[PDB]
């Protein structure tokens, strides 16, 4: 059973059918056993794609609503609301998986940081469309606990620790409107990883996140 | 209301939500008025995106299905589920063409455009048909293209992008579905040469380049 659902999720991924992929990995998670690295990466990939499509459509429609008659504005508004409901339902589904299964079963610091980052991300997507104060604080609290754990248990070049710093820096910039704290957090993460330059299997992923941290710093300084 | 359905379809398009876009254009069509050129292009774009997603997925999974026992059956079943979606999309489009678009089309340009679309959607059914229901599907695609082909040769300039795109797709039908590369090459080269002889020009020269790219691929 669990095996078959994982193989169906992989098939759906190759077919670029991410809603199918996410439904497979949701069912795996609901079986209540701690996920392997491979399973949690499938779950993360599936939902990031599913929510990413809705966030992209929301930005396009939200903006059309803001640049607009009255009949046309209202159409855009109602369509924005429809996409928002899809996006909210997806975030709530992931956050429910995180509360009920993933975070309670996480037996290692690496996975606890992984899931607390995910929780930070999905409240941050809720914050993008938000009630907003409470959502923002839930995001900030998940990131902050992830951040403390990763600093205590992970090397500064660990891709999960770097990816957490990238996303928490984006949260400070874009959600909290605290650009100086965003730049401070991103520059420290980049500089500490440069100082300790890593195993074979992580070269590519750590350094790719380093490039994104520096690209954000370039953008936010220029 | 037509006009507001059309606005919704443009917004769906902007949001890259092509299933929403197609549902809006299906509703516009089902109001029974002849579609404007803008509406016709919206309908075509929406469904070409919606069916294109399933054809792309089908090709991936089908490929895995063949290149592999419990795992072969799982791929087979998934391929079947994608095929059902694809077949339902094509059937939807083909009903709209039969019931509303082809009978109401009052200009040769429209009539060619929709008969080509009918050739196309039976061709996508032909790509996934197996067993006994294939020869009849292939024949329906061929007959639709042939009708479109005879009207376009009579009524349209050889450089008209609709006439050129019909030659492009009909030549693909002969190559990929009828396994008739000589007929495919001859149809594509004639369409190219006839447009050269009598030389929307951006669309026209783009499709001429595609005609000659297929000739190069099929010769090579």
């Amino acid at each position: 059973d669990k095996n078959e659902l994982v193989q169906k999720a992989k098939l759906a991924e190759q077919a670029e059918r991410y809603d199918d992929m996410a439904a497979c990995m949701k069912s795996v998670t609901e079986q209540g056993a701690e996920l392997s690295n491979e399973e949690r990466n499938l779950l993360s990939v599936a939902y990031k794609n599913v929510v990413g499509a809705r966030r992209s459509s929301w930005r396009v429609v939200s903006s059309i609503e803001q640049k607009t008659a009255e009949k046309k504005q209202q159409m855009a508004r109602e369509y924005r609301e429809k996409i928002e409901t899809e996006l909210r339902d997806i975030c709530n589904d992931v956050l429910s998986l995180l509360e009920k299964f993933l975070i309670p079963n996480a037996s290692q610091a690496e996975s606890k940081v992984f899931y607390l980052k995910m929780k930070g991300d999905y409240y941050r997507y809720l914050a993008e469309v938000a009630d907003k104060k409470g959502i923002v604080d839930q995001s900030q609290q998940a990131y902050q606990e992830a951040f403390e754990i990763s600093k205590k248990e992970m090397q500064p070049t660990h891709p999960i620790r770097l990816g957490l710093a990238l996303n928490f820096s984006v949260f400070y910039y874009e959600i909290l409107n605290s650009p100086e704290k965003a730049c401070s957090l991103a520059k420290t993460a980049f500089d500490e990883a440069i100082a300790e330059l890593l195993s074979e299997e992580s070269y590519k992923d750590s350094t790719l996140i380093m490039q994104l941290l520096r690209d954000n710093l370039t953008l936010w300084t220029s | 209301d037509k006009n507001e359905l059309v606005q919704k379809a443009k917004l769906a398009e902007q949001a890259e939500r092509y299933d929403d876009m197609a549902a809006c254009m299906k509703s516009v069509t089902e109001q029974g008025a002849e579609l404007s050129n803008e509406e016709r292009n919206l309908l075509s774009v929406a469904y070409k995106n919606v069916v294109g997603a399933r054809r792309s997925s089908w090709r991936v999974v089908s490929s895995i299905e063949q290149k592999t026992e419990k795992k072969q059956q799982m791929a087979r079943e998934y391929r079947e589920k994608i095929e059902t979606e694809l077949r339902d999309i094509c059937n939807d489009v083909l009903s709209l063409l039969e019931k509303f678009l082809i009978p109401n089309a009052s200009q040769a340009e429209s009539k060619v455009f929709y008969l080509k679309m009918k050739g196309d959607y039976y061709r996508y059914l032909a790509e996934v048909a197996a067993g006994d229901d294939k020869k009849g599907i292939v024949d329906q695609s061929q007959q639709a293209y042939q009708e479109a082909f005879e009207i376009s040769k009579k009524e349209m300039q050889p450089t008209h992008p609709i006439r050129l795109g019909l030659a492009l797709n009909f030549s693909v039908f002969y190559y990929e579905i009828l396994n008739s590369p000589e007929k495919a090459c001859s149809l594509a080269k004639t369409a190219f040469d006839e447009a050269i002889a009598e030389l929307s020009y951006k669309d026209s020269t783009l499709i001429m380049q595609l005609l000659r790219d297929n000739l190069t691929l099929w010769t090579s």
Partner: peptide, 14 residues
């Protein structure tokens, strides 16, 4: 913009 963590041809759309 800012970043967070990550055969024959037929007729195309016009």
């Amino acid at each position: 913009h800012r970043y967070s963590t990550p055969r024959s041809t037929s007729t195309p759309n016009v």
